[PDB]
Automatic annotation (TrEMBL), chain A:
Domain of life: Viruses
The protein's name in its UniProt record: VP3
Length: 50, 50
């Protein structure tokens, strides 16, 4: 049983498992609400007499 | 520091090993350190006797 094979296999496995353990999940989603800028009422025309 | 006392300070030997980001386990860090260290060490005594 040539020894040099298993050393390479073990190194590959260790590198892979260490690469899989650094990946982290961290999202930065923003909320769905709006801003609601200012507004003013609009008055409709009418008539007046007495 | 004084008479009949001698201090054996510890000095870092091998500076590899990367922390586990998943933070689930502590033994995985030690396993990584040991495996990489002995992968380096076994390359110095491939077919050699002291």
């Amino acid at each position: 049983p040539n020894d040099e094979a298993t050393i390479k296999a073990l190194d590959n496995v260790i590198k892979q498992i260490e690469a899989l353990s650094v990946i982290v999940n961290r999202s930065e989603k923003a909320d769905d609400a709006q801003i609601l800028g200012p507004n003013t009422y609009k008055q409709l025309l009418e008539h007046l007499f007495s | 520091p004084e008479e009949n006392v001698y201090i054996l300070l510890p000095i870092q030997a091998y500076t590899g090993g990367v922390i586990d980001r998943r933070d689930a386990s502590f033994s995985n860090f030690a396993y990584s350190i040991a495996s990489k260290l002995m992968m380096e060490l076994s390359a110095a005594t491939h077919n050699k006797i002291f």
